[PDB]
Amino acid sequence: ANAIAVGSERSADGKGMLLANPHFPWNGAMRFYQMHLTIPGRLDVMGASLPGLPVVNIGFSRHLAWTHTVDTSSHFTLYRLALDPKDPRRYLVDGRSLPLEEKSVAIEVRGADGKLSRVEHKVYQSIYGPLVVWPGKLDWNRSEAYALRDANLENTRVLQQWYSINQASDVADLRRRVEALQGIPWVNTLAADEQGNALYMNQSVVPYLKPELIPACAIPQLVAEGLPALQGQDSRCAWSRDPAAAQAGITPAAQLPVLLRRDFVQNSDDSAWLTNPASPLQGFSPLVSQEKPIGPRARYALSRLQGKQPLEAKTLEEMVTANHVFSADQVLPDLLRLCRDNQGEKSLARACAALAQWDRGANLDSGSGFVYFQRFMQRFAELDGAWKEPFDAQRPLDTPQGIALDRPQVATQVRQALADAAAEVEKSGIPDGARWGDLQVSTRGQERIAIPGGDGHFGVYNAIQSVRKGDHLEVVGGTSYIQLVTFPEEGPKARGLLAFSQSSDPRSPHYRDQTELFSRQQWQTLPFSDRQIDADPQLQRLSIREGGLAADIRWTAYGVPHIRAKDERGLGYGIGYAYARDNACLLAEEIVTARGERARYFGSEGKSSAELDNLPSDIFYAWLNQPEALQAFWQAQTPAVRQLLEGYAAGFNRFLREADGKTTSCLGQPWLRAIATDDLLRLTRRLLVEGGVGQFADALVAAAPPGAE
Ligand SMILES: CCCCCCCCCCCCCC(=O)N[C@@H](CCC(=O)N[C@H](Cc1ccc(O)cc1)C1=NCC[C@@H](C(=O)NCC(N)=O)N1)C(=O)O
């Protein structure tokens, strides 16, 4: 993700300004969806959110605009256990042997001959949490095993937190509602408001260890691999329980980085350190924020944001639509000198020509040099001492830079990496003179739409991640919801797109209408006031009831629903109905995943949208969403949240009762069925653990002791 909040001192109009550009999948449980929610007098906020959630995750209201980026804090800890030398099913805490908890789950699998079979798996849990095995790496042998405590497994405030965010009026109000509830799982928060404040917050759920305990409790080699690993045989290494924290064992708000400014704040998924170099954030816990080099996306943003010139909204827009490969600025000059110097080797002929013609961009009409440059960087990045100016912690904006072509070995190393990378390119039969837009596409039914942008690792702000599928590169994630908000006196003027369009269903009119506009990088008005909404020639209005539940739904262009209701139940009613019309098949599938029933419907020869095999994914979510977990989670929800969720499941089921396949391709499938509120709790918890134990779902299923059946 990228995010830039400009305050009154740097904005051309003297008011707040926010650029929101998260990078998320183009399919599955994390596919963003535009919506505008309104409960008159209490709630009116527009933006985008994740499937199944009756709140807005990134958006804006009349005086405020906020967004999220991934942070560098830890949201879980790996605990290395010391096993009882006489029983690998027992572990030691301060030298005392304790039994491992044993919990059985059962899964149903549909065989090839349609028959059903039951699979039972045992999950072992320590006082820290479930045991995980990364075979070969985090083994369960006779002296040690590994457990994983996910801090968000105990976060029941997650939906209450965003619903509170949706009611925030400005930056001060926003800062209060997040600090008080501490419900954000694993993202930063940046925001601007009409009065010209710019806010950055590393306010999330972070395990708490007092600073003096960290050098002793941390495992150095594993922390060196970026893993938050603690000693699990020492009671002094349990998470510290500060009574000022909203959840037992997490870091209280006052210790997490916050920066309020009137010039600007930015973040492109690095630590809080360089949110604004004029005001560095240092001296925090290493579980919270370290002073490490920033990625090229942040360097690009900071280079363009330097100085004191007033910024226009189109300047923020063009920082994305430019598709500038910022990493070439540090490598391409030296690389082209090498290229001309070696105008003899006929091998390097094609690559050097493409690199010389390359416009240093990732646009649709950018030359094939971008492909050559990409493969070169992958092999240049695995070479120590190749940077002429290596990283200097005192110049982290200008460093590293340049190729040290002066030394004899690196010169022939860089020439070797270029020669290797060039061979890989022509080994794929890519035509001569092919442009980037001819290669990177997004499949829409039977056709392909060219998608500009490139992978963020190369400093492309408009980060686009794709994989090779057949004769092209299929876009899999990246720039999703785009939001650029300013605050003229008339009202919030917002402008953006949903790159993959509102509906994942090919039958829908909103399956590729915004993807075509993204291909041409034509951002559109996001209508918020009733004047813009009601003056749309494409407006469609409809009221629905049952019971009770009622909602007033307006649809503007590209299928963006605007839901008006009297209470949370009716608000959820409209949300569930509108989202089902666009994405009923997506949610039906993801609910089957979060229920642990993929092998029941699709058999064991399949994968989930998370590229997890059907059987291990089922075992994990059966453990994660067992009924005791759902009951305990539900009983911890505020009444408003429970009414939102109840309304959603009703609005979803209301559409299924009327569905005739017009915008629903999975009509007739046995897994397309009415949903309950607990199904929505499963999707929520599935998203919660995505910053922690969810990333270890296969490792949890793999954990078995020596012996055992
Ligand atoms: C109920 C719950 C509801 C939740 C509601 C959530 C609503 C908010 C949505 C969040 C949107 C952010 C997603 C997003 O925007 N991710 C990005 C993540 C991008 C990313 O983080 N990319 C870097 C590499 C990088 C960094 C800086 C650059 O400038 C360029 C590249 C990285 N990726 C892999 C992990 C990590 C790493 O490995 N480094 C540690 C190490 N030791 O090396 N860093 C991506 O999905 O694309």
Swiss-Prot record:
GO terms for cellular component: cytoplasm; periplasmic space. This step of the maturation process may not be very specific. The active site is at A1 (nucleophile). Gene3D superfamilies: 1.10.1400.10, 2.30.120.10, Glutamine Phosphoribosylpyrophosphate, subunit 1, domain 1, Penicillin Amidohydrolase, domain 1. Its EC number is 3.5.1.97. It comes from the Bacteria. Keywords: Hydrolase, Periplasm, Quorum sensing, Signal, Zymogen. One of its GO terms (biological process) is single-species biofilm formation. Belongs to the peptidase S45 family. It catalyses: an N-acyl-L-homoserine lactone + H2O = L-homoserine lactone + a carboxylate. Catalyzes the deacylation of acyl-homoserine lactone (AHL or acyl-HSL), releasing homoserine lactone (HSL) and the corresponding fatty acid. Possesses a specificity for the degradation of long-chain acyl-HSLs (side chains of 11 to 14 carbons in length). Degrades 3-oxo-C12-HSL, one of the two main AHL signal molecules of P.aeruginosa, and thereby functions as a quorum quencher, inhibiting the las quorum-sensing system. Therefore, may enable P.aeruginosa to modulate its own quorum-sensing-dependent pathogenic potential. Also appears to be required for pyoverdin biosynthesis. The keyword Transmembrane helix does not apply. It is found in: Periplasm. It is an enzyme of class 3 (hydrolase). This is Acyl-homoserine lactone acylase PvdQ. CDD domains: Ntn_CA. It holds the Pfam family Penicil_amidase. Heterodimer of an alpha subunit and a beta subunit processed from the same precursor.
